[PDB]
Structures are given as structure tokens and as C-alpha cells.
Amino acid sequence: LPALKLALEYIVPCMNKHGICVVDDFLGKETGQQIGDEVRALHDTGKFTDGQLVSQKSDSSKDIRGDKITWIEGKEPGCETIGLLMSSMDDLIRHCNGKLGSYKINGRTKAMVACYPGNGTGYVRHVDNPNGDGRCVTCIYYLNKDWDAKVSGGILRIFPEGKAQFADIEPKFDRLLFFWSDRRNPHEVQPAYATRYAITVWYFDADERARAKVKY
Ligand SMILES: O=C(O)CNC(=O)c1ncc2c(I)cccc2c1O
Ligand SMILES: [Fe+2]
16 A cells, blocks of 8 residues: 555566556545546536547548547646546655666656547557657556456557567556556557546656757
């Protein structure tokens, strides 16, 4: 339970060895459900974008859109538990600093709340930071209660380094995931056939971000 124990006994060794780390039952049912209620309220009050344009070849009404997003700072009214999650992620990273590779984390992005609408859209294979923009660690929190991939799809498939086999991660309720943001972890989201929510924050390495400024 103690953030420092989780960090030192699991996250750090797992990340340095696999570059990926999954933590289940991170905040508990109560808090996880509260975060779910907050994200759902954001959706129901129209705070999300309409979704990534998947197919344009169509004509306005025929357009297909995918993942919808909304940026959350964490202090907005109705988003405080999301803020609590962010602070909890920050706490783990703080306890890991100086131990995640040779990176020195000194900041992060706001939270990106994503919603795959369940219309069969996913996210194409990609690398979060392929050009050295400063991001070294991707942190994702999932909040989909009773998610069954064999039925609803939406698996996050990561292809670690240049190894043959890949890793499938179900977007399970109260699951926390960390992985290196660079080319070591290309990944994709398989088609989702039910509403799928995730909250992502990216952590910056001090040196990479300092020189990224000279790239604009
Ligand atoms: O949701 C997951 O399990 C994994 N998603 C992603 O990798 C992922 N990566 C980058 C993203 C961007 I630049 C913008 C919207 C959504 C998004 C994503 O959803
Ligand atoms: Fe990604």
C-alpha cells in the first residue's frame, strides 16, 4: 500500500527490467469508482472532443471518429478525485526518481482523459515520443469496471524493444500502467466495442526536455 514500498519493491525493478509495469487495484474500489463518476460526468457534460478523425474519405455525415479527449489540470470543480489520482501518480514517481533508468524527472503534462466510444475504433500503432520531446515515462490509469476484452476488445498491445512476442494489457478498472515513452515501446489500442476510459500523464526527463526547447 505505501507508495514508497510499491515504488522500490516493484515499479523500479519492473521498469528497469521490462520497461513496462502494471499495478492492479491502485486506489481501491471507492476512489476508483469516484474517478469513474467524475470522468463520466465530463463525458455527459460535453467536455470531451468529438473524437479523432479516422476516415475522412467520407462526406461530413459519413465521417468516422475515434478516441475523444479532454485535458484535466486536476483542480477543476468535479475533477478533484482525478487530481487526487494525479497527485498519487506524482508521489510514486517522486519515490522512483533517480532509479528509473538514468532519467531525472522534473515535471509532467496535465492529465489527458481519453474515451474510446465503443464504435469499433482503436488507436494505430505508434510511439508516444519518437522525436525526443522530453517525455520519458507514460503513466495510464484505467477505470473500466468488469472489462472483458474477449468481448469488448480494446486491448493495449505493446511491442517491447525488438522482441518477437508482444504484451497485451487489458484496460481493467483501477489498473495503473507505466512504460517508457520512447521507441522502446511502440504500441496500439485494438478496436474497442464498448465505452473505454483511460487517464494518461507523461513525465519529463530534465535533460531531454531542456534541449527539446531548442527544437520548438
Ligand atoms: O489507452 C491506452 O491503453 C493507450 N493509449 C494510447 O497509447 C494513446 N497514445 C497517445 C494518444 C494521443 I497523442 C491523443 C489521444 C489518445 C492517445 C492514446 O489513447
Ligand atoms: Fe500511446
